Amino acid sequence: LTEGEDYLVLDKPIPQEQSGKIEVLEFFGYFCVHCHHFDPLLLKLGKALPSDAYLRTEHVVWQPEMLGLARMAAAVNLSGLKYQANPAVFKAVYEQKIRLENRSVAGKWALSQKGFDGKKLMRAYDSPEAAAAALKMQKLTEQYRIDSTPTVIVGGKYRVIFNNGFDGGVHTIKELVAKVREERK
Incomplete structure (x- = not known):
């Protein structure tokens, strides 16, 4: 993980749905085109995420x-x-x-x-x-300032940069969950 390369620090944190667990929040739109009419990232994260991590989604409102x-x-x-x-x-x-x-x-x-x-x-x-x-x-x-879909925020604090494609994304998210967990000790 590298600041400015893999992830960004939110200036104001987004309050989690649930405390104690580590949120993985996805902002999305129904205009995001998926070959099977479901987001493959949400499906993959559901299985690959550690036990103390959870998924949250919000529809982006641009207009x-x-x-x-x-x-x-x-x-x-x-x-x-x-x-x-x-x-x-x-x-x-x-x-x-x-x-x-x-x-x-x-x-x-x-x-x-x-x-x-x-x-x-x-x-x-x-x-x-x-x-x-x-x-x-x-x-x-x-x-x-969510101006892009999908945008992923982890533990309310860290915004993913998708610099290495799909699979580089899941890896970055997983490392960020491990970053948040350790820091909240």
């Missing part, structure tokens, strides 16, 4: 309209429908046939879907928790 995409991400997470629903969400965003950022369009879309409880997803979508979470994602994007 005011994008609060709609962030609200979808919050709905999915909060409904507990990540693996049943996200693939269909990526695909809808990829095709660009409907403005999924719009609540009523999102609702009509969700209810017509064959592969998951769209009613459960929409219940989470119209709950105060999901609207709040969507706005928090905007605050996070702005407050911490």
Whole structure:
């Protein structure tokens, strides 16, 4: 690991979801194009990370309209429908046939879907928790200058530099988790 080469020090730390464990936070967008409609980095990290590390994701909000995409991400997470629903969400965003950022369009879309409880997803979508979470994602994007997807932050402090491709990324993340663990002694 080298400062300025492999990683960067955040000027203000991002408060972790859970204390005691080491957060690995990914900022993402549903406009990130993946060959199987899921992020291969999240899948790899889920298995390669040590036992005391956990994964967090936030949808990036770059334009005011994008609060709609962030609200979808919050709905999915909060409904507990990540693996049943996200693939269909990526695909809808990829095709660009409907403005999924719009609540009523999102609702009509969700209810017509064959592969998951769209009613459960929409219940989470119209709950105060999901609207709040969507706005928090905007605050996070702005407050911490997230201008790039994916961006990975470890233990709230260290921002990955993807200087060596995919696999160099997992290695950097793993070393950063070991850095955070040791420093919090």
